Ligand binder design. Structure first.
Ligand code: 4OQ
Length: 278
């Protein structure tokens, strides 16, 4: 308990941050967006009701930073609650983009490369995300990409966790968590970028679990519309055999990512997808 108090930041976050807006809530905690009073920068704040495992989870994010994730900024202990302050991007989510606009292969390759760089970083720190999906991809107006975990699924490698439509078959059937489940989920997110939705989204989420466990590798609606290079990338993300499925490091070398357009190419999609607060 004393070590946890020594690692956390000094101060009252109720005074250091303002304009709190709840953006998510679950069994594990609550997510807010807030304004850093001193810097004028918009941040994201997780509030979790609480110990040596918490110490390790805090230390790994305080000591390790990467441009493609929302980075740890501070943490506070308020009674029995731990508050973790992190970066935030206000342009929108990849969900907004795929539901409202149509991305071309160059824009998909740009997003895939940024997400894989975030995954390579997390996996190199023995962290598995377990909840990769467009909802967890935040976008800046300039097209910058940051991965979030607003469903509280990520953890340092030590129950069924994740969002059913994006879950790997080995997670559904035997909870075999490992870095490759994030690669599968990235392949499902690439299908969102092509088709607007993950496979089976018209079904209820529990029925989706049975379809994933039985079908395995999902099929595309119109595969002939895609380049052979993009089809190969998707095959490597969605391999049934975990050993054959690409790692984030291996997929960063894929020819598909070599057609990536600059991130600035995303700005018109982000602007069109954005629904202004009335
Ligand atoms: C807020 C930062 N953060 C994170 C961002 C973004 C993301 F999607 C997952 C993250 N989770 C990280 N870990 C550790 C913390 N515990 C609670 C969850 C798993 C993490 C790891 C590392 Cl090496 C660096 C940053 C991380």
């Amino acid at each position: 308990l004393e070590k946890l108090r020594s690692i956390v930041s000094v101060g009252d976050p109720k005074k250091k941050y303002t304009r709190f807006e709840k953006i998510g809530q679950g069994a594990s905690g609550t997510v807010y967006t807030a304004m850093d009073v001193a810097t004028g920068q918009e941040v994201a704040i997780k509030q979790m009701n609480l110990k040596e495992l918490i110490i390790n989870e805090i230390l790994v994010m305080r000591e390790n930073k990467n441009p493609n994730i929302v980075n740890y900024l501070d943490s506070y202990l308020v009674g029995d609650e731990l508050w973790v302050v992190m970066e935030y991007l206000a342009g929108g989510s990849l969900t907004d983009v795929v539901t409202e606009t149509c991305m071309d292969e160059g824009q998909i390759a740009a997003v895939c490369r940024e997400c894989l760089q975030a995954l390579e970083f997390l996996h190199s720190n023995q962290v598995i995300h377990r909840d990769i999906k467009s909802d967890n991809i935040l976008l800046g107006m300039d097209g910058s990409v940051k991965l979030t975990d607003f469903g509280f699924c990520a953890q340092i490698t030590p129950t069924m966790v994740g969002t059913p439509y994006w879950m790997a078959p080995e997670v559904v059937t035997r909870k075999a968590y490992g870095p490759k489940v994030d690669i599968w989920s990235l392949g499902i997110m690439a299908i969102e970028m092509i088709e607007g939705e993950p496979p089976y989204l018209n079904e209820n989420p529990l029925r989706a679990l049975y379809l994933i466990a039985t079908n395995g590798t999902p099929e595309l609606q119109n595969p002939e519309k895609l380049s052979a290079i993009f089809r190969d990338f998707l095959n490597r993300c969605l391999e049934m055999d975990v050993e054959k499925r690409g790692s984030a490091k291996e997929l960063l070398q894929h020819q598909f990512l070599k057609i990536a357009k600059p991130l600035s190419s995303l700005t018109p999609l982000i602007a069109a997808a954005k629904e202004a607060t009335k």
